[PDB]
Amino acid sequence: SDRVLQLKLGNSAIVTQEAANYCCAYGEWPNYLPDHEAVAIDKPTQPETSTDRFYTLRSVKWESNSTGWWWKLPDALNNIGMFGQNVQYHYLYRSGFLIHVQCNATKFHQGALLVVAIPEHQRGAHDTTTSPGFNDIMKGERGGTFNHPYVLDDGTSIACATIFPHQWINLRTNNSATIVLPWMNVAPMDFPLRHNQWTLAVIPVVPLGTRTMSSVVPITVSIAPMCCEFNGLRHAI
């Protein structure tokens, strides 16, 4: 009942028969920008189905010594489908996100992944005073990996990361995590190519293990923008 779930947006749908309810970040739900909070005065374009749909990124392999993975939003999708086109042709964008992380294995496998959506995850560099560079941060669709997940690559800690919207994928329990993200920013809209509102982090707190036949166990991320709005139309960057 709270273990099965179907998500349908646009021409895309996803089902899971081993879910664990689902998270609505801070108890909120995505919505379009109201007139009393608007700033940009040009009429926005609201593409709906062409952008508010699931985009599946390339999978990653969960290995015995993996440290974790991360994908920044909207960067990860800024070059995918019609969402990517609207982003490139407009100076301003706004949207929520429906995140679905997938990972199945066997009843003989064990492992636990923390799936957390971090707002404003400003990365820090290790053992140097030089700030992270553009290429250290903007990985796009491929995403990046954690160097020191223990401190969330920012000098804090993964132990307290549960203060952020999250779920876990504990192999003996579930095979997917779902998190709904509302627009999260101090401004009603933003320039999509230089600022990432959210960072999806998937970290194996308990490593993958088993004594049965060894198989490649992938982790897959599907993300659907929600209530997309774009302003400041011009040429593609």
Partner: protein, 247 residues
């Protein structure tokens, strides 16, 4: 008496404080008020008046030549005629305007701007131009096919001599600000470019080089915040006669 205690800040002189103070001349009767034309109550009233942009701010252009942009009959099509940097908080064609000068006494701004151009060629001269506003993000467009994708107005020369390009307030944040970095995400406004839509066409006895005068002003959805000293004036020494005021 009343028991009291002094708080931090006591005795200080804050130039922006607001208190009453001892009248120097008790019982003084100020001259009666008289109606005078042109009273202004909010500086926003002043920046709504359009003034001339110094678009031709180039070496070789002297004085008033800098206040007009000359366009000529072209031999090629879709020609780029000129562009205009848009930070009303930095030095450029928009700085010495009513909106630019007053805005520079502040640090934050918000609102739509309007650019009006008046064609000053002869009556027998005709033409169509396209004025484009490109929101920030990339490099300034250099071709009409690219500029045309942004906000724009196609202008046809005729009896009504002037066209207005509205630069709508399109910003992620409520306000934009000055911080001396023209490429900052909270400062860059984008670009304005002008191309021939068709061409300037004139008969043999009309001048084949004509001028445009561009004006700019704020609309009434404008707002300015955080007063600061203007960078447009300064002094190194005493002005002539200043010391004589003590003699």
């Amino acid at each position: 008496g009343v028991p009291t205690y002094l708080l931090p800040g006591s005795g200080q002189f804050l130039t922006t404080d607001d208190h009453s103070s001892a009248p120097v001349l008790p019982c003084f009767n100020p001259t009666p008020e008289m109606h005078i034309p042109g009273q202004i109550r909010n500086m926003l009233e002043m920046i709504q008046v359009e003034s001339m942009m110094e678009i031709n701010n180039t070496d070789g252009a002297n004085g008033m030549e800098r206040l007009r942009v000359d366009i000529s009959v072209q031999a090629d099509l879709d020609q780029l005629l000129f562009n205009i940097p848009l930070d009303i908080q930095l030095d450029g064609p928009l700085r010495n305007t009513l909106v630019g000068n007053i805005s520079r006494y502040y640090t934050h701004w918000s609102g739509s701007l309007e650019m009006t151009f008046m064609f000053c060629g002869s009556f027998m001269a005709t033409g169509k131009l396209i004025l484009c506003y490109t929101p920030p993000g990339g490099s300034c467009p250099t071709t009409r096919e690219t500029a045309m994708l942004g906000t724009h107005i196609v202008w046809d020369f005729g009896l009504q001599s002037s066209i207005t390009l509205i630069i709508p307030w399109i910003s992620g944040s409520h306000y934009r600000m000055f911080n001396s970095d023209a490429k900052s995400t909270n400062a860059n406004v984008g670009y304005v470019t002008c191309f021939m839509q068709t061409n300037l066409i004139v008969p043999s006895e009309s001048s084949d080089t004509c001028s445009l005068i561009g004006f700019i002003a704020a609309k009434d959805d404008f707002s300015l915040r955080l007063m600061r000293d203007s960078p447009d004036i300064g002094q190194s020494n005493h002005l002539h006669g200043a010391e004589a005021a003590y003699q």
